[PDB]
Design a protein around this motif. Structure first.
Motif: not given
Lengths: 91, 91
Positions: A4-5, A9, A11-12, A32, A54, A82, A84
């Motif tokens: 995931i890194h 990202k 957000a919202k 996630a 997600f 979110d 990504y």
């Protein structure tokens, strides 16, 4: 393990289809991290996953063949989402 | 606005490093809400924040790239700490 890194990202934020015939894959999961791992490995996906959203409420992965930079989709605000985007296809 | 509800709280708990060179970000703030907001937004963090600890005494945020489920860190009791793990990467 934790890929995931590898993602940037937002957000919202979610991605909405601009093209009506654009296919995206979905799946109800637990974390996630499962979405990110499946995305980077392209496991079970018929295309190269460049980003995933997600749904924090449904605990659902939304895998996309393109990121916000393409004409096929664009960002949209959403409290339960979110976004990504894998850094490999950004900038 | 208040994203702290997106986290599962473990009172009087902090995360201690098992991994020698695991990096975490810190910052003196006014409230735990600032910690949660910065974490969910990943603002100023070079990784995906999965959890944060609030030092109730110093009023300091400790942002982590992993939660207790990973081998790199684990829970530890501490009167002045509260651990917040985002539900998105839990269970």
């Amino acid at each position: 393990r934790n890929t995931i890194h590898e993602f940037k990202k937002s957000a919202k934020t979610t991605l909405i289809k601009i093209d009506p015939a654009l296919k995206i894959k979905t799946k109800k999961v637990n974390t996630a991290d499962q979405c990110a791992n499946r995305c980077t490995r392209n496991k079970g996906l018929p295309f190269t996953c460049k980003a995933f959203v997600f749904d924090k409420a449904r605990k659902q992965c939304l895998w996309f063949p393109f990121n916000s930079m393409s004409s096929g989709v664009k960002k949209e605000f959403g409290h339960e989402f979110d976004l990504y985007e894998n850094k490999d296809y950004i900038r």
